[PDB]
């Protein structure tokens, strides 16, 4: 579950552990303790031994710092992503798919984890389907009849105009249905009535 923060912590700890362990490395030099080098060699050669050791250790610090720069850049990308997620989904309702949850989005709740943030995207998912016979327009009186908002479906014999994301049939009336043109150009136009209130 929490792998995406556990890895942050473990990578930081591992980098520091490697940086510490580098102290024992010799880098070709006779030993990795400077006092022994000073108290066992003459200054001219103690000089070069220390030179090599300093170069190695400084280069180790340098690579540590560069790796940290790159990790910080990637974490800043994730922090910009988290800021956008909190703004767009905690403080609103997002309209872009798969940004704030698999499915249609309703809300979101933040929870503060150590070195991170956790969101609880409360989404909406349709479950149970039922096939139907659908027709783009209904030619009542020669004129076509597009559904004002919804799809045309037929439970076999009768036609209803339901919404698209939750089956809920209503009888056809002039308020579900707007008209534009005539039933001579569109294909799949059908013949039905449109009750007038």
């Amino acid at each position: 579950a929490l792998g995406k923060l556990q890895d942050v912590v473990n990578h930081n700890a591992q980098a520091l552990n490697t940086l510490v362990k580098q102290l024992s490395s010799k880098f070709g030099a006779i030993s990795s303790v400077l006092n022994d080098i000073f108290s066992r060699l003459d200054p001219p050669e103690a000089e070069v031994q220390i030179d090599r050791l300093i170069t190695g250790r400084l280069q180790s610090l340098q690579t540590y710092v560069t790796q940290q720069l790159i990790r910080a850049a990637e974490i800043r990308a994730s922090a910009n992503l988290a800021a956008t997620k909190m703004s767009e989904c905690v403080l609103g309702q997002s309209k872009r798919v798969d940004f704030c949850g698999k499915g249609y989005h309703l809300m979101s709740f933040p929870q503060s984890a150590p070195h991170g943030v956790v969101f609880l995207h409360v989404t909406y998912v349709p479950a149970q389907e039922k096939n139907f016979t659908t027709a783009p327009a209904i030619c009542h009186d020669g004129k076509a009849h597009f559904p004002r908002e919804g799809v045309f479906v037929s439970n076999g014999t009768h036609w209803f105009v339901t919404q698209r994301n939750f089956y809920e049939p209503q009888i056809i009336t002039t308020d579900n249905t707007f008209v534009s043109g005539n039933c001579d150009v569109v294909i799949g136009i059908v013949n039905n009535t449109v009750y007038d209130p």
């Binding site: 300093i54 250790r57 988290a82 909190m86 984890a113 991170g116 659908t134 939750f166």
Partner: protein, 235 residues
Amino acid sequence: GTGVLTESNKKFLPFQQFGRDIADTTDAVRDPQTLEILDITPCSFGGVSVITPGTNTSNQVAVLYQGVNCTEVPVAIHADQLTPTWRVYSTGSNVFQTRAGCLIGAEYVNNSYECDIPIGAGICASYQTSQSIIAYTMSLGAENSVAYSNNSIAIPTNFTISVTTEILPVSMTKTSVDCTMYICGDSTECSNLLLQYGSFCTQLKRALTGIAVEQDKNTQEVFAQVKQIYKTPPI
């Protein structure tokens, strides 16, 4: 140098003896005592890679030899050629060749399952049944044929309310290093020699301070988007 010697079909000009390549390594040589032009090629090699279920579960294991074909891999027994002390695998009967390299220790299965130990080029091993390591091409999923028709729609009559977590990192630990004490602790001569390298320690110090303040800004701009703290109502 070491390697394998080959009858080079190439022709040297009468005065230069040996060739080279992109890197200045020798890639040919005119053999003395025979005046024959000889090639050089490194003895075959390649990384190995171990495929193990967790030790808490099993102790048997399959080994992947990357790149190499399944011809020289068994020939290379540990006694002479195979450097690692892996003698049983150099003789196993379960040798199977994939596009990643010759692998030893798994039985190829003609089935297909969603897998856990990726190998490469589709293959991926696992543990199954009298129970050992398999090696099978992965399965993308249950190949479905969604029914298209030009007068049939499918309208959902029932919903559900998922709630799915999503975990994002925000900040990291704000380390900081002490250049001189790290490189050499309490050695004045070493400090003298160390200051001679210029603005390295200052540069590291500056970079790490930049990272730390960036962390503080990260947390501040992820969470502190609220004008004033609010209270939940009593009821």
